[PDB]
Design an enzyme around this catalytic site. Sequence first.
Site, mmCIF file in Angstrom:
data_model
loop_
_atom_site.group_PDB
_atom_site.id
_atom_site.type_symbol
_atom_site.label_atom_id
_atom_site.label_comp_id
_atom_site.label_asym_id
_atom_site.label_seq_id
_atom_site.Cartn_x
_atom_site.Cartn_y
_atom_site.Cartn_z
ATOM 1 N N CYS A 38 36.419 -39.011 16.354
ATOM 2 C CA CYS A 38 36.301 -38.946 17.785
ATOM 3 C C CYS A 38 37.459 -38.098 18.252
ATOM 4 C CB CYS A 38 36.366 -40.383 18.389
ATOM 5 S SG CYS A 38 38.093 -41.060 18.341
ATOM 6 N N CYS A 80 39.936 -43.094 14.601
ATOM 7 C CA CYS A 80 38.913 -42.035 14.712
ATOM 8 C C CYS A 80 39.459 -40.755 15.328
ATOM 9 C CB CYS A 80 37.730 -42.501 15.570
ATOM 10 S SG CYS A 80 38.125 -42.890 17.313
#
Length: 252
Positions: free
Chosen positions: A157, A75
Amino acid sequence: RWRQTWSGPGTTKRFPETVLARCVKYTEIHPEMRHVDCQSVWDAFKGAFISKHPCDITEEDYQPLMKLGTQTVPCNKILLWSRIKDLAHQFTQVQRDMFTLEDTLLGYLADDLTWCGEFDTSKINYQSCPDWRKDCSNNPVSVFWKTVSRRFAEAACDVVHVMLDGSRSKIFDKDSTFGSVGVHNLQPEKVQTLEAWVIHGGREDSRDLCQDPTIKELESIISKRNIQFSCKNIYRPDKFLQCVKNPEDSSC
Ligand SMILES: NC(=O)c1ccc[n+]([C@@H]2O[C@H](COP(=O)(O)O)[C@@H](O)[C@H]2O)c1
């Protein structure tokens, strides 16, 4: 016939066989996707658009495919892009670390392909397909990319990167998949920073395009979502790739 039904190019020739072979090739190469039955992937992909009006496609239509294509991607290593496709992929092919959407099973299956069906039949339409602009935006291709780009944006992320084409008059374009889907689906709870790399159109010796009005726009939208914005010019993309392949040594 001298007039087709829609304004867009028709389904890529050998669509079924191409998608299926792409699925084989991907699942052979990527060990995490080894369990995947490719015939089922093909079945679900078909189910999204066959016998359905190609101007009435919904994200639901593609949910069975999305399930079968469930994939965990690092991520913090996500690379988004807008318009500037080739450098994005050449970059990840060396930096086999960052991942674009086309490095996932689902993006890899659909990359550069066109497809649509017909309401009245189970035929694939190889003659024409809806143009997003002239015909309708709820078409099989546009709805697919929206659904998959959204989920990919939601998985990101940390620092997320985006390559933009700095030779466009709209370096950042609110109407691109990136601007309409990607920017609004990054999750502020997870994403610390969006870092834009503004890819220069060659030229040489040029402007700081991180000051471009549309970049200030991007910065404002991102900051108001509570995500930090960062920008870098990439003046010489030919030298950039060379430095990626050969970190240090000479003028890197
Ligand atoms: N590879 C393709 O055929 C294709 C087409 C449209 C969108 N996308 C995805 O959407 C983004 C780029 O689209 P835009 O150029 O409309 O911003 C990227 O994150 C990309 O992965 C891919």
